[PDB]
Design a protein around this ligand. Structure first.
Ligand SMILES: CC[C@H]1[C@H](O[C@@H]2O[C@H](CO)[C@@H](O)[C@H](O)[C@H]2O)OC=C(C(=O)OC)[C@H]1C[C@@H]1NCCc2c1[nH]c1ccccc21
Ligand SMILES: CC[C@H]1[C@H](O[C@@H]2O[C@H](CO)[C@@H](O)[C@H](O)[C@H]2O)OC=C(C(=O)OC)[C@H]1C[C@@H]1NCCc2c1[nH]c1ccccc21
Ligand SMILES: CC[C@H]1[C@H](O[C@@H]2O[C@H](CO)[C@@H](O)[C@H](O)[C@H]2O)OC=C(C(=O)OC)[C@H]1C[C@@H]1NCCc2c1[nH]c1ccccc21
Lengths: 472, 464, 464
């Protein structure tokens, strides 16, 4: 029960992918290694099944086909990302610009347009050129901000004549928390036995991300927006934080959990400063913005993309022995999916995603309430699914649960727009089944089935549902 | 401690693969499905990791593979024609697929272009689906006659350039796991499955022998004179070591052997199945007509022999049970030999010795070759290529094994060939890709190919 | 006055190039950046004319180049594999780049297709960036083990067709200008630079020797038997002539030599560095474990030797200063020999003689080859090709030089090879393209290729 009609005339329906997870051909067409190759190649034991995005799902060879599948599905827009290191193999500009790479993107762009599909480019989705990570520590250094400027500029210039929707960072919260705190994702530092420092690094990284985002955005506003007629934003994520009980401790915990995952970023792009909740708890470990930075950061995005998966009960926690100072612990908030052994929502394959359609509602509404953002897009939305091998294609593709999941989720999204909040886009994650980072290929997210061996692609029932729904 | 020199001037050193396990491209170049596609597609829960021979892609990458062969220094490589790629529909009305017969010619010519001897197994379990379907495959005497046409087409098509032909690879396995255990294409007989494990295996091998016979006669009578080649059949057995020195155990080794090897050799010697089988299977073991018996006697040019391991044996309605012989790898909880990844393969270099010697003693065979020999290896994901390839244990494995093969030659038995199984890592049938057998590593995803230490060792050794 | 005949029947006449200086196409065919790209891109103010090895384009134009080689009559050509083109990411997890290994195979096959002997240096300073980056490159014992894998891949990949292997070209230079002078990739140690000129060079060459050792053992043990080739290492020195006949000057030549050549040879002889070095560098000169010392003794199949010039030498915290020996080209303001374009190269044909003789006398080496020999030439722009190519002085240069090499053979020393540096004019490292070394002129812009008189001379001379 929910149709195209209940959504604005101009609302955009879409799905996504991302270089590393899709393109494959890591070592073809002159592409320079990203930290994600290196992670997955030097540290394969940190991948659930030991795999890597070397071939991924081979979107780099098969684009013409994929865009076929897109149009069959009726996507209004697809969201993909440029592998930084495929346009600039060595990271900076001295290393040179790789012509094979820029052909691909152009070919790809032109193909989407040739099929009536709106291109939407994330600049950075964690596939940071190894070259840079290596030289100066990547985002551990303010050197990155400047190189990201060049990268951003090059792209806008090279391709921007034809894409009107730019994204700087995809889920920088994740990138830095999983990267420099959990040690679970490229470059894999901070976690135990790992090389970093989980008390310091995350905060440095995100500090620089915001500083890069800022330079990226300014570049575009001042030198390109006037002509290309486009919009840059940044897409962030959060779980919804539901107070476990109606006590103050929980109520406040929600604020800290929210601030520390979302505010961490939004607040700067709002006030010019980090959540006080964080300043309060993180103290000297949380870097300061120059007086100018603060101002230039205020309202410095054209839109916020928003990725939602799940919601957790939240509560203030007490430990304090074998606490190591770490970002993990700093938001003194214990999460749990259980109220009174009752889960918050049905528990999907991972053990982490729980279907909570209504968390998306609460979160969006929250983001208006607290961050008064002009333009909002649900940029990632979707359900995980175990990759059962030993079942026929005939079966795997009857993903009713996934149809349902997007129905319910769209229902909340409608309910958010209806109550004021200015959502303008739903983006199914993921268009195709792809490489699920540290989980490799043990699961699937897409509305188009992909055989991780043959690369063959068959549409799930969800895709079909969606084809009909996009067409009201 | 073992060198090239310890072996006859003429002894051949080689390695192998097998259509289904290698070629991939199941549905390209107009190939017709085999039972092994079907098995693996319709029944993928019977595969350890659910996978299939659909794609290690030797079908596209042959020119490269032959390079690697020649680097390794192989004197000969042993491959197999997918029956169903030259005759998509099984019989001759279905037609001859030109794309397929180009491949094999391209491939054979490539081998010879590089100094490598081609050696063609005709059947390695990828029977065309079309045939399995139409008349039950090897459960029908219809197969014998079509196998003859296949055989004949081939020899005619390619034989002007290959001098080593094999009819069946491991028919014992084919029939026992196929129609008894239900574990391999077409997957009948086993629990919940469709066949009958008391009947089918016997009918099946009874026809295979009848097929092999027709294949061989075709060859001797119409092709041997010209192509000056040699047809044989490759069989396999575990060595059977009596658990203790009592007669019950001694007689059990007789039964165990008869039931696994004699099942085939004895016909190809006396023209009749092992008395041990006749006595136990009685009426469920089909009879050979008077004529069949004679034409079957000494009806091979050589026996190939596949060895992997040996089991202690002792005294204990289906074929599994019919050789009333309990198998076990433990003496006094002592293993017979070191236990390789599977739980099944144990390194028993001296079982090859014992077995070869046995085959001379019992079946007086003119020419023998060790056509499959090699060690399994766990497909550990989560380790660097740098490591995976330091297969010390596999070098050792082949050393020890060649050590026993020398010893066999030295004591009369006429082995003329060692053949590493398998040249490349490939699709390990019902275990899919959770293990590896090869001297050349293969990335099951990228198809990329890097040589193991073992292959390097072998490169040196071939070169004495 | 000097002909072919004055030289052994078996003596090889050749010329050379070097990946970075020739191939160009730094970013095509999937090659991974070396430190020398990086150096030249991030640090182009350290290059005389600011240029880089990005593009003399031998990578596209090989077939042509091999023609020119064969016109010239070269018996063998000496090139180098860009480590970073077969292994883009340095180690094996980064993967093997097929495009690259096609090139070298295409290239090797081309040489042999034309009657020219292939001769592969493994390392000529284009270390993969990925490695330099990850663990400091040669400042870490990590390099030894990866160099082994590189070495091994190669021999395996191509070795079935090349019979002359070299581990390192001029490691002395690599380490001294690299980590002492800061003048060559990665450019550390020198004034304002990042290294330490008292420590690094010693650690670096200490590892190079450790690498060379591992490379060589790999070869002897696993490949020599088959490919029947030979691995060595190419070193270099100036000849050191005492300024006067006092002992201070005599002892200085000992130090000068030890510190430049002994630094390497002595380990590859006794298993230890020159006592002269041990005495002066003390604790900053790392020690070889008991095992390393033995496995290092006589650990080469031949020494290649690069000669350019000779310096008068005399008595005088960084390696430059540690051999307390002031160098000078002037006796009594008389130059040691005619002063070539740079200010550094002086024509001293007889220094090659002296040096070769010295190396026999001091390091008793089985086989020696003159692997690099040639004269620099100013890249005068503003003159016609007609003129540039009348390199009389370069003909003369090689004559005189071969004259001394003959004389060396004649007095016992076992030289087996003269190799003109450089076949083609190419990228002269930190001097970029402001000079030329070759017997084949190359238009640094158009890549066009016309042979100098020198090349013609050499064509005749090779042909006695
Ligand atoms: C790194 C993925 C984060 C994920 O980011 C997106 O994930 C998409 C699909 O999951 C992916 O395709 C896209 O690139 C991302 O934008 O979002 C949130 C995470 C965290 O907690 C909020 C991450 C995932 C989360 N982390 C905790 C455990 C867990 C997560 N996802 C699953 C799924 C199944 C089992 C466990 C888990
Ligand atoms: C079906 C393969 C049989 C195998 O046939 C050859 O095996 C190669 C690899 O095993 C294969 O590539 C080639 O095609 C064959 O010629 O050999 C014999 C078997 C057998 O059961 O007893 C003799 C079979 C294997 C044996 N079966 C019982 C348990 C088991 C076997 N092999 C492994 C390996 C790892 C774990 C368990 C096992
Ligand atoms: C770095 C090159 C060294 C060179 O190494 C070979 O040189 C070839 C050309 O010189 C080159 O193509 C090949 O790669 C090398 O095997 O030889 C030795 C040097 C040295 O400093 O003392 C021995 C080096 C050169 C020497 N360095 C000090 C000053 C100088 C040198 N060569 C010239 C040439 C012109 C002006 C100055 C100089």
């Amino acid at each position: 029960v929910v149709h195209r009609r209940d959504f604005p005339q101009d609302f955009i329906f879409g799905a996504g992918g991302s270089a590393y997870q899709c393109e494959g051909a890591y070592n073809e067409g002159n592409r320079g290694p990203s930290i994600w190759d290196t992670f997955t190649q030097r540290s394969p034991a940190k991948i659930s099944d030991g795999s890597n995005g070397n071939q991924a799902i081979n979107c780099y060879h098969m684009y013409k086909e994929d865009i076929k599948i897109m149009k069959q599905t009726g996507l209004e827009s697809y969201r993909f990302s440029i592998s930084w290191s495929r346009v600039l193999p060595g990271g900076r500009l001295a290393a040179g610009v790789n012509k094979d790479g820029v052909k691909f993107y152009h070919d790809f762009i032109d193909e989407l347009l040739a099929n009536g599909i709106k291109p939407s480019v994330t600049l950075f989705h964690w596939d940071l050129p190894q070259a840079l990570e290596d030289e100066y520590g990547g985002f551990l250094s303010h050197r990155i901000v400047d190189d990201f400027c060049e990268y951003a500029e090059f792209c806008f210039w090279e391709f921007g004549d034809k894409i009107k929707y730019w994204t700087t960072f995809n889920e920088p919260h994740t990138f830095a928390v999983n990267g420099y705190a959990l040690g679970e994702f490229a470059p894999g530092r901070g976690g135990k036995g790992d090389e970093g420092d989980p008390a310091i690094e995350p905060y440095v990284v995100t500090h620089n991300i915001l500083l890069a985002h800022k330079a990226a955005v300014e570049e575009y506003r001042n030198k390109f927006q006037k002509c290309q007629e486009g919009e840059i934003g940044i897409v962030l994520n959060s779980m919804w934080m539901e107070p476990l009980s109606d006590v103050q401790a929980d109520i406040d915990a929600q604020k800290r959990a929210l601030d520390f995952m979302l505010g961490w970023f939004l607040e700067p792009l709002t006030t010019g400063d980090y959540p006080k909740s964080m300043r309060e708890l993180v103290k000297g470990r949380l870097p300061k913005f120059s007086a100018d930075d603060s101002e230039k950061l205020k309202g410095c995005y054209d839109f916020i993309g928003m990725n939602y998966y799940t919601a957790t009960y939240v509560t203030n926690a007490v430990k304090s022995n074998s606490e190591k100072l770490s970002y993990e612990t700093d938001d003194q908030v214990t999460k749990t999916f259980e109220r009174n052994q009752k889960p918050i929502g049905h528990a999907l394959y991972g053990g982490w995603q729980h279907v909570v359609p209504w968390g998306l509602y609460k979160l969006l509404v929250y983001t208006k309430e607290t961050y008064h953002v002009p333009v909002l897009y649900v940029t990632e939305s979707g359900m995980v699914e175990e990759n059962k091998t030993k079942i026929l294609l005939s079966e795997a593709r009857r993903d009713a649960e996934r149809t349902d999941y997007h129905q319910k989720h769209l229902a909340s999204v409608r309910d958010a727009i209806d109550d004021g909040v200015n959502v303008k886009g739903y983006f199914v994650w993921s268009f195709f089944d792809n490489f699920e980072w540290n989980l490799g290929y043990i699961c699937r997210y897409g509305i188009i089935h992909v055989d991780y061996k043959s690369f063959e692609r068959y549409p799930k029932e969800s895709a079909i549902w969606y084809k009909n729904f996009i067409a009201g």
